[PDB]
Design a protein around this motif. Structure first.
Motif, PDB file in Angstrom:
ATOM      1  N   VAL A   1       1.117  -1.308  -0.519  1.00 12.49           N
ATOM      2  CA  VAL A   1       0.131   0.150  -0.613  1.00 12.49           C
ATOM      3  C   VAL A   1       0.971   1.363   0.061  1.00 12.49           C
ATOM      4  O   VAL A   1       0.794   1.822  -0.592  1.00 12.49           O
TER       5      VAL A   1
ATOM      6  N   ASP B   1      -4.619   5.463  -4.376  1.00 12.27           N
ATOM      7  CA  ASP B   1      -5.018   5.141  -3.297  1.00 12.27           C
ATOM      8  C   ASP B   1      -5.851   3.743  -2.936  1.00 12.27           C
ATOM      9  O   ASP B   1      -6.419   3.850  -2.238  1.00 12.27           O
ATOM     10  N   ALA B   2      -4.396   3.136  -2.618  1.00  8.78           N
ATOM     11  CA  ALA B   2      -4.638   2.184  -1.528  1.00  8.78           C
ATOM     12  C   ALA B   2      -4.809   2.447  -0.102  1.00  8.78           C
ATOM     13  O   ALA B   2      -4.412   3.347  -0.033  1.00  8.78           O
ATOM     14  N   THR B   3      -5.442   1.517   0.261  1.00  9.16           N
ATOM     15  CA  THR B   3      -6.184   1.533   1.821  1.00  9.16           C
ATOM     16  C   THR B   3      -6.028   0.214   2.957  1.00  9.16           C
ATOM     17  O   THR B   3      -5.976  -0.745   2.497  1.00  9.16           O
ATOM     18  N   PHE B   4      -5.279   0.304   3.805  1.00  9.76           N
ATOM     19  CA  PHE B   4      -5.130  -0.422   4.668  1.00  9.76           C
ATOM     20  C   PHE B   4      -5.620  -0.245   6.174  1.00  9.76           C
ATOM     21  O   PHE B   4      -5.351   0.936   6.285  1.00  9.76           O
TER      22      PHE B   4
END
Ligand SMILES: [Ca+2]
Ligand SMILES: [Ca+2]
Lengths: 397, 397
Positions: free
Chosen positions: A275, A284-287
């Motif tokens: 991410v 705009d990757a999320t964890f």
């Protein structure tokens, strides 16, 4: 883009490699904090307004000022050290992560170590206990302050199963036992003195939990929690939007409690790194956070779990109940009385993969806030997981 | 309360036993539709307004009118039978469920059967293929109309792995092959004629899919779907609020497609029965639907899955892509392009429990509508499941 990455863990290399796959035209410098890779090099300070990191090579003393468009902090953690005498002797080895564990294990060879004492009976401590006794036949003792091994990972009742696995394969275990001082002979450790006994040790492993290694973030003005963990959003951004952080130096939401947690687990590295890699490339990757899934392989059994233990849920002030089911396989399911929410699940088995399959089914559900009915109805490939949900619905009625 | 239960499957006994644990003062009559248990007894008609079921003992002809407060329909299914000659011969055996499968397997003994032809290469067909060849050394051939075995459960590409497991352990498999007629000698089957060959068979297993056995619901005026499946709400109530139904005679929501589905799977029985039991006792337990989790053990490998196959997703009109990953272990992940939703997951491995653990992790997630990122980040105890999510995010980019 120039991106600077501080720390080589799993997380740093992962973030950079993912970054590069997406933006091959960019430049990355990685500092090991002891692809332009500077070893035996330390970041001394971060100037956020100026987007600069001052670094110093520790051998030659040559100092340099790197400029960055984006920074990644992969600072890792440091071993908690009891404020006791002799914690400076040679042979006293902190181990804060599984990579470090593997390093120590493969740096030892036949006939080098006679006695090992492991201070801490958590994930790291127990894995080291097993490795030292099994790979090398080292006389191994675990000493744990809490009244149980694996505190916060299994219940007291379940921990005994793991305890027995250790004791029957010659690992001695002491619980409710405090380290009072270490005693030495060449400026090398030779004895551990507890409040209950004296143990001979030429190797002492510190595996009693960790603190985030965040002085550099602190000096830079980054928002940190009371524990010193760097606070990040779900994109893994710190309070400075050009600076990312992950791994054992950050806090992220505990997805069961809804409160901030701390998850210095191996598994988090790769997932969070990816991410961070994508977001360094303008994605705009999320964890979202974590629930704390884990597994330990012991001599004959395996233990595995996710979320809260009953004692853990009680410590958070849930009116929780621990429901157990046996088949050898034992599962324990942790349930909040008034909401019927499942807060956690742990187990032990001689069948490793079979238990893992049961824990996984529920672990990926925990963040969605399942209730006992969701476990009764879990559409697992009747199965012991469903049986645990039925017994819990019965215990609650 | 008097509750009448029609059918002894898994579902009937489960519903009644759960009912009784909660309301021990109530009475239950169970009819086997060939705890007051009437065997060799058929329900002839249901009068909903009057709350009565007319029954007839099939041996003596004695007819009786039972009265009920609540009714449970556990009517099961019937084997689909090709409209071909000889489908009336002795030796032609429908098998509509795993219990029926086990019955046939244990009714055979050494030297009784020489040649078995299995019509249908689905879950039932393949399990029977394996049992007959492995328990009894019966010469076994599977004949499947579709161009692949396990249609709708694995992809074409994955089915070949399962096909090989069968062929290398002496099960012959024919696909794209239609049954034209059965030929007989004593009024007992002796040959199956396909559009491509003649096969000798003294046993022919019909495992080519099922239809709900719902004439009794139909005559009673219960709302049925176009397939004849009894329509129930999530409490397992039919269009008549005093009449419950479950198992292979009902339709419930497909939790991936959001449309009505049909799940004549063993596993559903126990879970739905429990809910029916609780609701007969005035509870408000729910069963939301299904995603279709399954597992088959073959000679050396195991196959497992949940949700849609790629061909299945394409047939529903999703712009779907099948992403595969190998490690021996293969996973295939089915993804909707525009939403990034995961629609399904299947796999094959020589390690049964290890694959199950991977399929379970995702299967319990499918109903919550996970996306590729949820699979990249799945908090499984890097792991092949996460790798599948990363490859799919890569294939989609
Ligand atoms: Ca001395
Ligand atoms: Ca003849």
């Amino acid at each position: 883009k120039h991106v600077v990455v501080i720390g080589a863990v799993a997380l740093g290399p992962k973030a950079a490699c993912r970054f590069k796959r997406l933006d091959p035209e960019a430049h990355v410098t990685m500092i090991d904090q002891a692809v332009e890779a500077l070893v035996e090099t330390r970041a001394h300070a971060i100037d956020r307004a100026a987007h600069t990191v001052e670094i110093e090579n520790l051998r030659t003393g040559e100092r340099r000022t790197l400029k960055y468009d984006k920074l990644v902090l992969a600072l890792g953690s440091k071993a908690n050290r009891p404020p006791v005498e002799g914690m400076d002797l040679a042979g006293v080895t902190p181990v804060t992560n599984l990579d470090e564990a593997e390093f120590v294990q493969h740096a030892i060879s036949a006939g080098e170590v006679s006695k090992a004492v492991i201070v801490g009976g958590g994930f790291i401590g127990l894995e080291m206990a097993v490795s030292l006794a099994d790979m090398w036949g080292i006389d191994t003792t675990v000493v744990e302050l809490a009244d149980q091994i694996m505190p916060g990972f299994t219940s007291k009742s379940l921990s005994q199963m793991l305890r027995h696995d250790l004791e029957k394969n010659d690992v001695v275990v002491h619980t409710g036992e405090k380290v009072v001082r270490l005693e030495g002979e060449n400026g090398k450790v030779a004895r551990v003195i507890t409040d209950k006994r004296t143990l001979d040790a030429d190797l002492v492993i510190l595996a009693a939990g960790v603190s985030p290694n965040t002085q550099l973030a602190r000096d830079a003005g980054l928002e940190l929690d009371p524990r010193g963990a760097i606070i990040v959003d779900t994109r893994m951004r710190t309070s400075d939007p050009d600076i990312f952080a992950g791994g054992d130096c950050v806090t992220i939401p505990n997805l069961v409690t809804g409160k901030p947690g701390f998850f210095p687990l191996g598994s988090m590295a790769n997932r969070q790194g990816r991410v961070i890699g994508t977001n360094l490339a303008d994605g705009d990757a999320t964890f979202p956070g974590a629930v704390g899934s884990w597994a330990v392989k012991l001599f004959e059994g395996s233990a595995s779990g996710a979320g809260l233990t009953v004692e853990g849920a009680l410590r958070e002030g849930y009116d929780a109940v621990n429901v157990h089911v046996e088949q050898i396989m034992t599962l324990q399911l942790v349930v909040d009385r008034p909401t019927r929410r499942v807060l956690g699940i742990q187990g032990f088995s001689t069948l490793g993969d079979a238990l893992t399959a049961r824990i996984n089914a529920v672990a990926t559900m925990l963040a969605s806030k399942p209730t006992v009915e969701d476990i009764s109805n879990a559409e697992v490939v009747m199965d012991i997981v469903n049986v645990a949900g039925n017994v819990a619905d019965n215990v609650l009625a």
